[PDB]
Each structure stands twice: as C-alpha cells, then as structure tokens.
Design a protein around this ligand. Structure first.
Ligand SMILES: OC[C@H]1O[C@H](O)[C@H](O)[C@@H](O)[C@H]1O
Ligand SMILES: [Ca+2]
Ligand SMILES: [Mn+2]
Length: 242
C-alpha cells in the first residue's frame, strides 16, 4: 500500500511542504488566508488565491488497476462583512493535473476557465459557493461536487454561520466510488451532508496535485474572507490486486 499523509493543526510561514499561489498568504497568527485582506482589515475584491501540497499524490495506477481511497479534513471560516453588494465567490477543495497554475478567478474559483463541461480539465472539486452565477442553483451558499466543470453534478444548500469556524470532512471510498462530504458548524450544531458517485480513474490523471483555492468577486466590495485554520489529508493506494 502506497500511502501519503499530512496534517497541519496550524500553518507556519516558510513551511516548504506548501505551495502558495496568487494572493494566498500565511499570517504570523498561523492562519491561511486564501484571498487578500486590505490594510484597513476588510476583504479585497478581485482576489484569487490557492495553496497546494508540495508533493503530487498517487491516486490510481494503470498497471495494477488500483484506485486509492482518501480523506481530507479542514477548518475554515468565511466572514461576509456586508450584505450589499452581494458577497462572492467562495472556496474549493480540488485535485487536478500536477504542476497546475491558478485558472480563472471569480465564479470559476481559480480552478476552471469557463463554465463548459470538458474532460480535458481532469479536475475534481468540492466547492463552498457563496455567489449565485448563471450556471448555479439560486440558493447560496451551497456545497457542490464539481467534476470537470464549474456546473456541479450535485449541490446542497447550507446556511452560513457568518464568521464562524466550519469543519469539513471529505471521504472517497474507491470500492464503491462514493465521494461523501460533510460540513459541521460547531457554533450552531448545523450538519450538512452530500454524496455522489465519482469514478476518479475516468476523471483524474494518475498523479494529482491536491489543494485549496478561494476567490472574491470582480465587482468592487463583492468580497469576503476565506480563512483556513487546519488541514489534513490521507490517501492509500493498494499497490497490488491479486
Ligand atoms: O459581484 C461579484 C461577481 O462579479 C461577477 O459577476 C462575477 O462573474 C461573479 O463571479 C462575482 O464575482
Ligand atoms: Ca458561483
Ligand atoms: Mn456552484
């Protein structure tokens, strides 16, 4: 069994295990800020940030025909300082081609370029969407499972606990091909669950980069914070199949 795993109970500036892109920055207080926050202390608009684990992950193996199972957990908070103009755009956990660079910002969350369904993206993502785009269901925010498209194959609306910490657990079981995700708000006790069938060998390349990405709106003040406090991941790939 080829296994990989990392756990950041806190983030440290200078940690070479993480690759920061765009506006993503680690504060001295140990918080990962995906999108920029101006000196006046308010979130900046038109900001896109990502953080990738410095090493690629082996998710499936063509030779043996094995697919890995995996689980990731992280804590984040989104503070929407104003009700108007509408806040945007959200954050997303994703897996895609290695050596990837940020894609389009805004409603594309830094991981897509358009709203088309395209295999070439070879990207899987679990979004926490705060703005209702044209391809989106009317309810926001919502959790979404994205497969080679910003247009989700499935969504679950949830209520935002403004500025409160949210706990997320995403698990993928290779044998059943089920990707189940959960979001819990300790502050209010709210529990949200969402699941869908995802055949990662048909979607992702054998080796993938794993990361988090966030973005704020293109309109002035259409912004919010996207803070991550802790993040862990573990993947197990059976090396053989007899
Ligand atoms: O107002 C913010 C809004 O700006 C544009 O409409 C973008 O397409 C959206 O993703 C969102 O960022
Ligand atoms: Ca959206
Ligand atoms: Mn969406």
């Amino acid at each position: 069994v080829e296994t990989i795993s990392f756990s950041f109970s806190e983030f440290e500036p200078g940690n070479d295990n993480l690759t920061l892109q765009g506006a993503s920055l680690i504060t001295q207080s140990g918080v990962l800020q995906l999108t920029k926050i101006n000196q006046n202390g308010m979130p900046a608009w038109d900001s896109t940030g990502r953080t990738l684990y410095a090493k690629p992950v082996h998710i499936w193996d063509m030779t043996t025909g094995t697919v890995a199972s995996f689980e990731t957990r992280f804590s984040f908070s989104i503070e929407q300082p104003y009700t108007r103009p509408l806040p945007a755009d959200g954050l997303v956990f994703f897996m895609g081609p290695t050596k990837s660079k940020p894609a389009q910002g805004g409603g594309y969350l830094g991981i897509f370029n358009n709203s088309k369904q395209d295999n070439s993206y070879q990207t899987l993502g679990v979004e926490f969407d705060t703005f209702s785009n044209q391809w989106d269901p009317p309810q926001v925010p919502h959790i979404g499972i994205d497969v080679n498209s910003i247009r989700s194959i499935k969504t679950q609306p949830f209520q935002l606990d403004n500025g409160q910490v949210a706990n997320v657990v995403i698990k993928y079981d290779a044998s059943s091909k089920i990707l189940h995700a959960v979001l819990v708000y300790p502050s209010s006790g709210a529990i949200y669950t969402i699941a869908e069938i995802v055949d990662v060998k048909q979607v992702l390349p054998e080796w993938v980069d794993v990361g988090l990405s966030g973005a704020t709106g293109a309109q002035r003040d259409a912004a919010e914070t996207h803070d991550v406090y802790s993040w862990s991941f573990q993947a197990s790939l059976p090396e053989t199949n007899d």
